[PDB]
């Protein structure tokens, strides 16, 4: 099948720091690299489909947020990666296919996707990281 | 005539989708392409001029948002256009000149500019569209 | 010594206009060029350090925001500078070193850094100016 973009885009942001951490300006979600242990939560992403009674709901990551079957937040330097797993909170069945995370069943799903650290990465370089997901459907 | 940039910039954004629409994250302005009917409102843009008692208030569209006396929101990839009309909500008269929408008389105008779909465009490709307007003043 | 980025980034923005000023869309920080008098405030920057009991808290300006021990907001096109002084409100001692503004003492400082116009610059060209500061620490 293939992804058809049809929806809005959610960006999950995380600033990764060392132990001595200097917050400058507006409050922003930050973690020290020591907090990037396996399964550590990064954040939730709300998803609400409508008009999808006969389509499989899908999310597509930006090109700089995936490599084959793996997802990652990408540093603002465009290089450094923070690998993550993406999981619905209702434990419904989804499939990953080259940047696309799509629901196995048709229907206008409403849910919450959690983004978690995939494998211990406590040596991740400091930086401002982002994962960008766009709604659509899989056919 | 010429436009002098002097003010701030308003960005009008719209995400166009198909009927099966998947909203991800925070609520943002989205429409299905079927909702892109003639005169459908894209959004308001508030304008307030100060110190322009002797100048003609003006809004300049970004280069990528105008051509041939026509304004349009443009997709993120610069390819796809969504043509619009730009209209103040009061009785005031304005002129379009090469990407600049300027008021026909001088004065520190304040008001609401509506951006509307110009001609039914229900086949617009899904994507993120933007129209950027910068305040300033115009003169011949 | 040298700077280690470790913290979040604060962006200070200002739109400079002429006397006839046309605000478009949401309110943003704007000043006429005539308001760019000596020491005119551009804005505050809240700073809170944690885990730095043994390091010197530091802010590093983007490469396009510093020169010759001078800091400045820069216009969108990277040409026009608006020189500023950066000063903590508690008048603690800090040092400037090639784009880094670091605290002379060690410790997890919590404070407010004010950004102010350095010398009257009432001829600054209208445009959008930005100063970007990143949190980290200085080490010898």
């Amino acid at each position: 099948g293939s992804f058809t973009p049809s929806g809005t885009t959610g960006t999950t942001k995380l600033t990764v720091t060392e132990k001595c951490q200097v917050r400058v300006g507006d409050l922003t979600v930050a973690k020290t690299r020591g907090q990037l242990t396996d399964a550590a939560p990064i954040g939730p992403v709300t998803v609400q489909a409508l008009g999808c009674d006969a389509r499989q709901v899908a999310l597509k990551a930006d090109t700089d947020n995936f490599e084959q079957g793996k997802f990652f937040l990408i540093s603002d330097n465009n290089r450094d990666k923070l690998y993550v797993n993406i999981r619905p909170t209702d434990n419904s069945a989804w499939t990953t296919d080259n940047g696309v995370f799509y629901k196995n069943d048709v229907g206008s799903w409403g849910g919450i996707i959690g983004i978690y650290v995939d494998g211990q990465q406590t040596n991740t370089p400091p930086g401002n990281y982002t994962l960008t997901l766009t709604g659509g459907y899989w056919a």
Side-chain angles (χ1 to χ4, degrees), chain A residues 9 17 60 72 86 101 112 137:
Chain A
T9 297
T17 75
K60 182 157 181 9
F72 45 86
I86 302 176
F101 189 71
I112 298 174
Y137 59 90

Side-chain angles (χ1 to χ4, degrees), chain A residues 6-137:
Chain A
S6 178
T8 62
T9 297
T11 306
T12 292
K13 305 191 178 152
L14 172 68
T15 288
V16 173
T17 75
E18 293 196 3
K19 216 296 182 175
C20 165
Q21 184 180 89
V22 182
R23 314 277 266 250
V24 181
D26 275 41
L27 300 163
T28 94
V29 187
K31 280 187 201 279
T32 66
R33 53 192 172 165
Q35 293 181 88
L36 298 177
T37 45
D38 192 24
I42 294 311
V45 178
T46 58
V47 174
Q48 182 63 68
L50 87 99
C52 301
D53 273 299
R55 307 278 198 169
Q56 293 164 76
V57 159
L59 298 297
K60 182 157 181 9
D62 272 10
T63 307
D64 52 5
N65 287 331
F66 75 89
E67 72 199 19
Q68 296 174 38
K70 291 169 142 273
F71 292 105
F72 45 86
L73 276 76
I74 194 68
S75 174
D76 277 355
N77 69 190
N78 307 129
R79 252 193 326 289
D80 302 326
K81 303 183 218 170
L82 177 55
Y83 289 95
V84 295
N85 280 314
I86 302 176
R87 192 169 80 235
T89 67
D90 73 352
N91 288 111
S92 47
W94 295 66
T95 299
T96 294
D97 193 326
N98 245 70
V100 183
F101 189 71
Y102 67 87
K103 206 179 183 286
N104 293 192
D105 195 9
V106 289
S108 296
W109 183 76
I112 298 174
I113 301 279
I115 306 301
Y116 307 89
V117 174
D118 182 13
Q120 179 161 343
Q121 290 168 87
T122 47
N123 285 337
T124 296
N128 300 310
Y129 289 76
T130 70
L131 168 64
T132 299
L133 297 168
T134 295
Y137 59 90

